[PDB]
Amino acid sequence: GLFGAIAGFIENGWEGMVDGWYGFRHQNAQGTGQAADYKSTQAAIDQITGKLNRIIKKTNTEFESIESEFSEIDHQIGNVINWTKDSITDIWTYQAELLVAMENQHTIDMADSEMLNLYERVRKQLRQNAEEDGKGCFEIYHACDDSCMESIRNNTYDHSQYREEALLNRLN
Amino acid sequence: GLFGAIAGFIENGWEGMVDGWYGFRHQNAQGTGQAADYKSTQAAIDQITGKLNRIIKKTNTEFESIESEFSEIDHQIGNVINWTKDSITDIWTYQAELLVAMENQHTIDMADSEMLNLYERVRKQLRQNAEEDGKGCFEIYHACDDSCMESIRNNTYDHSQYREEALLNRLN
Amino acid sequence: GLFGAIAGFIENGWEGMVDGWYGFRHQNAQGTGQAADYKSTQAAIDQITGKLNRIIKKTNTEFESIESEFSEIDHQIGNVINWTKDSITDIWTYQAELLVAMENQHTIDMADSEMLNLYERVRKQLRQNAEEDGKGCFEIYHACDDSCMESIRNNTYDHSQYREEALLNRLN
Amino acid sequence: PDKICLGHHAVANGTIVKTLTNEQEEVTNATETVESTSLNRLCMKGRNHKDLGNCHPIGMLIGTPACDLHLTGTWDTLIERKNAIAYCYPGATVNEEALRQKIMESGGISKINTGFTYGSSINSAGTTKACMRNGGNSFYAELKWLVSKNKGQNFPQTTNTYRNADTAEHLIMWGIHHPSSTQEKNDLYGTQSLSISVGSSTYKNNFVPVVGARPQVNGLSGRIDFHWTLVQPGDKITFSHNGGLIAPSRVSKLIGRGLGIQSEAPIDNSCESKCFWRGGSINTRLPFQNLSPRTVGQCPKYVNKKSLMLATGMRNVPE
Amino acid sequence: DPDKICLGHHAVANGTIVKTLTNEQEEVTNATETVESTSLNRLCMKGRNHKDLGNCHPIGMLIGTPACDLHLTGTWDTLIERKNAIAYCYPGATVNEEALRQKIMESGGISKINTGFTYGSSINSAGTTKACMRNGGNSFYAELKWLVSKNKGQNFPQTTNTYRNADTAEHLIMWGIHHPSSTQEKNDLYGTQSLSISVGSSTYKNNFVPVVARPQVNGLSGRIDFHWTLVQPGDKITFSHNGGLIAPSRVSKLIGRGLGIQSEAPIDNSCESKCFWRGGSINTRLPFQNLSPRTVGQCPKYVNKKSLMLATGMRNVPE
Amino acid sequence: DPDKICLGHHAVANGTIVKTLTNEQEEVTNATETVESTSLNRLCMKGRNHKDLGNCHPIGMLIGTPACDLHLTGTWDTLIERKNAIAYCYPGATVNEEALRQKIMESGGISKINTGFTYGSSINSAGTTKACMRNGGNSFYAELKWLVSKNKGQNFPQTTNTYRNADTAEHLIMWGIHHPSSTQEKNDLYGTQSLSISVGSSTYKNNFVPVVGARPQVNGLSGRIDFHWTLVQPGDKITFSHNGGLIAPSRVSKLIGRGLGIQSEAPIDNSCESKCFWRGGSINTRLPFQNLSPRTVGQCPKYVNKKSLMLATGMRNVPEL
Ligand SMILES: *[C@@H]1O[C@H](CO)[C@@H](O)[C@H](O)[C@H]1NC(C)=O
Ligand SMILES: *[C@@H]1O[C@H](CO)[C@@H](O)[C@H](O)[C@H]1NC(C)=O
């Protein structure tokens, strides 16, 4: 993918996570947890909603019949109508194929970008108190209880509180 | 946004900055300053100019009248013309709506990318002598006078000259 | 470009590299080397192949003649056909110009992204044992023989083996 | 060391979509953009509609028996059916398809009496076995078959003139009877050469009843060919004839605009639609459709595509 | 306490709303319009060898109606027709009127060629009417002659006139057939005899019988209906007539190509344009336009959109 | 003194210029053309049961002009009309000419069916002309008969002829009306009487009067034979009431299946394959667009007003110096 997270450095998705699109799993002394990120899940859903609002629509143009279902039309004008309609249908077929292909590419890469933006938000929060796993995880070099983990998810984690402890553990 | 800088980790824009699109604010002993980045501002403007050159155009195809303004036309051919013109107008309306929507998305994300590319250029310049604020700022761990700040903006800052001082301040 | 690697922090391309699109150059005690990355080269080529499969095609719609080559046509229907064909040609000309412009933009940025994703994969592998050059190179702070370099390319480099040596060299 | 992992959801059963680069890309969710489902009914709920059933639109102007329920009215939707009857007595209409199309764009028909009266030497109420009504022989309700009262006698050279007193244009229709044999012609209109002149400010034309052997349609070799023209407000149309004219009792006035539908599908006044085709209605919110290239109303665009799936979620990467 | 360098982007107090793929209300720093709503109520004719026909209808320049006297020949790259323009001084119409008008309005000029036609002593070539006034005195179509008997009541001499196309390009020949009001008027001008008018070329062939009651147009129940055909190079057209023919003095030749404009808007030779409509000129550099679906020349495409704003700056994130 | 691993991308000496959304002169490593400029000046007929009409105009196949004698019946999937092809030996035209031509050029073959029409002793069926030469001797349209009186001046017998369609598919019946030069010629062939020709089916009905008037000579003949046509549905009859001036069919035609009609001056080639044709020949390209002609037939790349449109197939080229 463009942003290298989904089908990238994050090996696979979580079938277990059913309350959001993006979120966290942690392990500390006290045990394991899982929680969804609202802000980033809603960002992705709202952008997809926007596309559906734009694409699931028809023109309000009223078209009348120019081909009789039940009677023969002059052969020359019939051939012009047939040529014109088939030309219009080739254009709309092409436009439809390109629209969906293009939007599908954007939707996938957009979703990839929202995952990466969350990862980068956390990376910067943890500052010098953590290191990148390579698999989308952060090894935290201090006791991070369920209250500390909550502070990372809620964007209230203060790196300065745990800095001295963390740098000692990192340098060893 | 796709690149997570503008309407992202950078909290808001600067109404005060009127000599460029992207730039720096610094605080040192000497006081406060602000300066625009030319290279990255011109990169964004040149790409938008390119779009306007491609989009602000009509075809040089000469079209003649097929509908008389002042006299009645044969009813059958009139209905064919009406069907054809309305079909063409539905296509152009759609193409116009999609073009502008697609370019607008790209322009915004392109501008986001130029901001991020500047941030990443600075991050790499400062190497081990600075740490990420999380709000698009770099905390520099050494005396950086107005001449040092200028060296960061002008892409001439040599990390090796301040390294030993900076690492001591960082480890404390 | 969008991802800031190709025509970005990587100053130029390698005319010398003729066995792949992306790859590595290293310098150690033992000397200099160059090798192509298969996975990332094939990723870029497969995406471009996909585009060619979608774009190098015509519709299977059978069109008949509505203009006689060898005889004069009624003047009114001739003008309608001329107007319709010119309108259709304006649409296809526009669609063709936009398709190629849009795909060209995507191909370039896609290739940029595959370069960056490889750089970021390596960055994370080396963890605290290396520092970013700023020019797309990694300064490794330990003896990295041709076998160690091979381990970086093959994604088998274990940072923990060289960590204590590297951190000492980095802090001095 | 403690550990915090970032991740995204996945699903067991993902959906395949096409991208710019990949023909088989698995995502968590997708939705269809092309409608393949039709309702085999004409959804007429919001609509002052008129189902002509057995009646062909031209039949409502000349008043064929089958059209007796359809000689006047107002509508926003008119539904023509297959094998609908326009002519009880065999014949055709010059510019048939232009007239049919004109009626099917209309939003109703008003009728206006022509007032035409004929001398004692003309029989106005000529009838045929083909146009049955109340179980007895009859004729087109809006026209009169003018014949001599004394069989064989030459037809009185007569003149009838309709004036348009209205503020809007009127659609006048008449017939010319082309008999099978010279025996039948002389029997009804007399031995003399026949001429029928029709003249207005705008329109002018002459008609000669041609006599010649032809195949039997409903056991009748005779033909009544119908003609028509618009009569502008305040303008007159005059019918100079010495026999062979089928004269109008009433002219027609097409009012406003309406959606013409040709379909075999039954009506349903519970269901709403703005898009119709031969096979019924299309109620879909989707932008495209692969049911028919022949549709009428506000319609999704026809595409040569079974399915086009639009991704509504990220790449599905299972474990 | 550590020194600090911050990165940031501009913003503005008054941002503009644009539509993106994902967001209907996206605020950016700057945007520009892509749909033109403004027209100039003038025909911008700078750099154009134009011809304003004013009161003259294009068909009138081929037959030579008084109003068209200044427009019988010339060269142009642009021809401007006006509302209620006069084609016929004497009441009548032209078969294939709109095909002929359209053909003239694509042309880049008209040349005239003498037919050379001469008539015996028993024919009056210079027949005149009160309807076609010129120099304040009775006259007729400049490019045609009204052929009548010199002795009133006398039968019209069976005459034959033939035009040969000596040129390398096709010529447009026009003639008229006079359909008189009454059998009294007909016998008075052409005589009691049955009238026939034959016209024949290699390609074209047709017969015309002057049909004889109708309402008065400018107080005249008489009609002169006009016909036309192309005559290929080296080919002849022959007029066999025993009275009732309105014969050409000159044939016409349409030269090169030109842009036909139907508009009520005045001329302006200071302003330049390549796009025109009923309401005037469209000079915009913008790709789209919502003024009219009826335009001519090199035009922005018509769209069903008031406004389409194209972002020319980043997201506006104010303080 | 520190070890170092550098990441990079390939480049090439000679890069190619493409257009993007933002940049008109963008250099990439490789690109490929999307617009075809090359045509083959030949009709590529490999795998096609084709028919080159050469000198024969499609309408000529229905009425049987000499030039068309080798093209009166057959089956094809491709029919090739040529420039200045002959439809009419005797001067005249066909009402709805272009609708009929177009109808034949969509067909996949022609069958012929005898009408069976017979005429009294007072009618000469085998009327001939100097214009329609065949076997080096005077002749006429093979599928029609020129009906004239056998005794010159004599009024033409009021005759009635009726064709029934016994077949399961519709048949294309054609007839002619002879419009003579002078009142002398008319009275000479059909007699002094006023002439009328009625044609009637279930669906079709029309009357025709042979008009007489002076006109220029085409192949030294001032006379005209104008042709008319209609479809006759299965089980339906068409009846010809005429008192002289009718050119009556000996045979009706049946158009079978479907075929691709091509108008071209280009020679045939049964070695080469194509599904797209124009005046100038064939278009074999796999490319999606084409700038050769807006007038094409078959499965074709779309016409564009563009010389070249280069599609990037590689990254930005950033060369070493
Ligand atoms: C137009 O197309 C329909 C089917 O798409 C076909 O049945 C019909 O015959 C065509 N009309 C002409 C005049 O070829
Ligand atoms: C074509 O469109 C215009 C505007 O809708 C309308 O006035 C005109 O009557 C239409 N023509 C026909 C023949 O229906």
Ligand SMILES: *[C@@H]1O[C@H](CO)[C@@H](O)[C@H](O)[C@H]1NC(C)=O
């Ligand atoms: C239609 O366009 C072609 C373009 O060359 C031209 O030759 C032809 O004469 C045009 N027909 C009319 C009626 O303008």
Ligand SMILES: *[C@@H]1O[C@H](CO)[C@@H](O)[C@H](O)[C@H]1NC(C)=O
């Ligand atoms: C927006 O762009 C145009 C330049 O074409 C200019 O009129 C306008 O002043 C620009 N900026 C703002 C902030 O309005």
Ligand SMILES: [Ca+2]
């Ligand atoms: Ca067809």
Ligand SMILES: [Ca+2]
């Ligand atoms: Ca209409």
